[PDB]
Amino acid sequence: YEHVRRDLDPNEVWEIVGELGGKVYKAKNKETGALAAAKVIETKEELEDYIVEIEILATCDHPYIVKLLGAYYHDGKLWIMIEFCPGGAVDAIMLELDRGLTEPQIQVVCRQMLEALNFLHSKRIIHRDLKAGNVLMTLEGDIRLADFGVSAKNLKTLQKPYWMAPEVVMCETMKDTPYDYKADIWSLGITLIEMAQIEPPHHELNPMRVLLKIAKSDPPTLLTPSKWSVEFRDFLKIALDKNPETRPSAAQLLEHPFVSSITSNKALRELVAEAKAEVMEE
Ligand SMILES: Cc1nc(Nc2ncc(C(=O)Nc3c(C)cccc3Cl)s2)cc(N2CCN(CCO)CC2)n1
Ligand SMILES: [Ca+2]
């Protein structure tokens, strides 16, 4: 049975039961009871973007990656059903609690993010859009990497020399292994800083000026380094290496002392508990 289901009717198994919010609908599974975040997109030429996105998710069965629960194309509308992550995105949590994550909370996220990235890169899949907004939480206090839109669009492009300039050679070399997957390692680093300080580095600047600033400036560091362990700072130092040639893998970073001793998700379970209690304040 293929990954996009033509034969079955989505309404048979799934029923919409609210909104989250182009749109994002909450959907109940009538057989199992399981909850899902649903997307019912009407398009019918470039829905192959979504099909490749679905085939990425289906291949990436991992604890720390969002689960594909089902994909159906049924008279004009494409249904993508993804496991419901009741904690929401980490950036939303920071907004609700009006603060950044603590270090033990960041250590868990980092550790679990590295396990997911080590897995994705094993499959020659690159996320290419890591940020706190794409790290979703469960109530047990585990992450789920979400939103493989950018990953899929990039993959579709790749799916479908004596005179070449050096800059062009470098940008076709950065498109293949073992350089392409290093982009996620840099983005992890920035995501960690975002979790420490709520906003990412260069947030004062507008997006056009930001690209130059990332190109021209030295790697970002933590604003108030006294608040953080030398292990966190050292982790950032090596992860935010501007040269992708010397920038370490996820596999290598899993052995760094900032994450190697992490054995419990407790700090994150607490975070999600605090955030959910905060939502109840009214
Ligand atoms: C926006 C949102 N999503 C939540 N969970 C998700 N699980 C999985 C998601 C996902 O895979 N989405 C997705 C899809 C489906 C397609 C393409 C691309 C993407 Cl990114 S989204 C929870 C949530 N909550 C409401 C608000 N808070 C409670 C009261 O305040 C917290 C809970 N809100
Ligand atoms: Ca924001």
Q: Which atom of ligand 1 is nearest to the CA of 279?
A: 30
Which amino acid is it at 49?
D
Helix 48-59, helix 149-159: angle, nearest 10: 110
- Final residue of a structural domain among 39, 68, 84: 84
Q: Which of 49, 61, 98, 129 is catalytic?
A: 129
- Indicate which residue's Cα is closest to atom 27 of ligand 1: 88
Cβ atoms within 10 Å of 46's Cβ, excluding its own: 9
> What CATH number is attached to the domain comprising 30?
3.30.200.20
Q: Is 129 a catalytic residue?
A: yes
57 lies in the same domain as 69: yes
Q: Which of 17, 19, 20, 142 to mutate to test the pocket of ligand 1 (most atoms within 8 A of CB)?
A: 20
Task: Using the mean position of ligand 2's atoms as its centre, give its distance from the Cα of residue 132 in Å.
Answer: 9
**CB contact at 8 A, 250 and 185:** yes
77 and 123 fall within a common domain: no
Q: Are residues 30 and 76 in the same domain?
A: yes
Q: Give the pocket of ligand 1 (CB within 6 Å).
A: 20, 24, 37, 39, 66, 80, 82, 84-86, 88, 136, 146-147, 279
Together in a domain, 155 and 264: yes
Maximum alpha-carbon separation in the chain = 67
Residues 185 and 80 in one domain: no
Task: Looking at the structure, tell me whether residues 29 and 69 fall in a common domain.
Answer: yes
Identify whether residues 16 and 67 lie together within a single domain.
yes
Backbone phi, then psi, for 256, in 5-degree steps? -70, 145
Say whether both 134 and 26 belong to one domain: no
Q: ∠ CA(129), CA(131), CA(137), 5° rounding?
A: 115
CATH number of the domain enclosing 172: 1.10.510.10
* Amino acid identity for residue 174 in this structure: M
What is the number of structural domains in the chain? 2
Q: Indicate whether 93 and 80 sit together in one domain.
A: no
110 and 29 part of one domain: no
Last residue within a domain, chosen from 36, 68, 84: 84
Range of the domain at 125: 85-282
Tokens of 13: 């198994």
- Residue finishing a domain among 84, 102, 135: 84
CB 93 within 8 A of CB 99: no
**Is 90 within any annotated ligand binding site?**
no
Does 133 lie in the same domain as 39? no
Q: Which long-range contacts (CB under 8 A, 24 or more apart) does 176-181 make?
A: 177/124, 179/244, 179/245, 180/126, 181/117, 181/120, 181/121, 181/124, 181/126, 181/249, 181/250
Same domain, 60 and 179: no
Please list the alpha-helical segments (H only) found in the chain.
10-13, 48-59, 90-97, 103-122, 149-159, 166-173, 182-197, 207-216, 230-239, 250-253, 266-280
